[PDB]
């Protein structure tokens, strides 16, 4: 089930058994890459880039077409995100709740939700330090979080 | 024996349950949209010949 | 607690009540009229 929520759900994606590019797809590996470079310069996350290609360009899986993942492609060209996408979004959510909470002292529920969000930040940051994505001095601070993202 | 008798009652309940949902499907559908299968040749998947 | 008994009795009777109601059902201005 969920790490914090009591509910347990089964909604997810199911990848097909066949890993080959379909015949009707007329884009090449090089053509897909320049589309990725164009959308990244527009300020789109790798999750959103893959959504756009699926919906409009008929690219079901970038990995099957080019042989590389979207984040790996961007890193090679030099368009790497400053912070990991899942960590970046969690910090953004904590800033929004803390900004709301400073104008509403009586919102006990928002105070409780803020604790849960910060716990996921600590778990995610500890994992990233072990993988050496983050320096072994990076720390999450409430005042520093606004400048972080 | 009670073990055999219980399974007879249960399998009768399931069989009539499948029949009830089948007559509902044919009622709320096109008259020709439902193929009709004989109970004997229902169990034959294919004859390779 | 006998508060559940009346609830469980009512729930079953409602299901049987669904069964019976299913069985029970089994010139220019002329357009506005």
């Amino acid at each position: 089930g969920r790490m914090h929520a009591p509910g347990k759900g089964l909604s997810q994606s199911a990848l097909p058994y066949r890993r080959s590019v379909p015949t009707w797809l007329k884009l090449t590996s090089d053509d897909v890459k320049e589309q990725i470079y164009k959308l990244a310069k527009k300020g789109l996350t790798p999750s959103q880039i893959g959504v756009i290609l699926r919906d409009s360009h008929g690219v079901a899986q970038v990995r099957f077409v080019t042989g590389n993942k979207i984040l790996r492609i961007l890193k090679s060209k030099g368009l790497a995100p400053d912070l990991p996408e899942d960590l970046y979004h969690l910090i953004k959510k904590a800033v929004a709740v803390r900004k709301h909470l400073e104008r509403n002292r009586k919102d006990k529920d928002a105070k409780f939700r803020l604790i849960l969000i910060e716990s996921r930040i600590h778990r995610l940051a500890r994992y990233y330090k072990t993988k050496r994505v983050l320096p072994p001095n990076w720390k999450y601070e409430s005042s520093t979080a606004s400048a972080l993202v | 024996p009670k073990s055999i008798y219980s399974q007879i009652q249960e399998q009768r309940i399931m069989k009539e349950a499948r029949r009830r949902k089948e007559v509902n499907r044919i009622k709320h559908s096109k008259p020709g949209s439902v193929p009709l299968v004989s109970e004997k040749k229902k169990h034959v998947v294919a004859v390779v010949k | 607690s006998t508060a559940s008994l009346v609830k469980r009795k009512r729930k079953v009777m409602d299901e049987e009540h669904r069964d019976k109601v299913r069985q029970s059902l089994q010139s220019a201005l002329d357009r506005f009229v």
Partner: protein
């Protein structure tokens, strides 16, 4: 219970089960060719689209995302692919 062969499910049995609970997983989504009205250019659109898809020729709205499937505009024609 009914006797089922775990090794050889029938085609009607597997298409009814949840996509993650089949013997081998398979999605229920697909890609389709849609033909725009006003200009007859063909566009490839995912069935469960999450973004508004515009015709490349004339920037006409082709579909609008919903909860399960993208609803298509009136007057366009579509074909499943593969």
């Amino acid at each position: 219970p009914l006797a089922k062969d775990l090794l050889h499910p029938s085609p009607e049995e597997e298409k009814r089960k949840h996509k993650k609970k089949r013997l081998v997983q398979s999605p229920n989504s697909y890609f389709m060719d849609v033909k725009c009205p006003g200009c007859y250019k063909i566009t490839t659109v995912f069935s469960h689209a999450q973004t508004v898809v515009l015709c490349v020729g004339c920037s006409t709205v082709l579909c609008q995302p919903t909860g399960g499937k993208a609803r298509l505009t009136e007057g366009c024609s579509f074909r499943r692919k593969q």
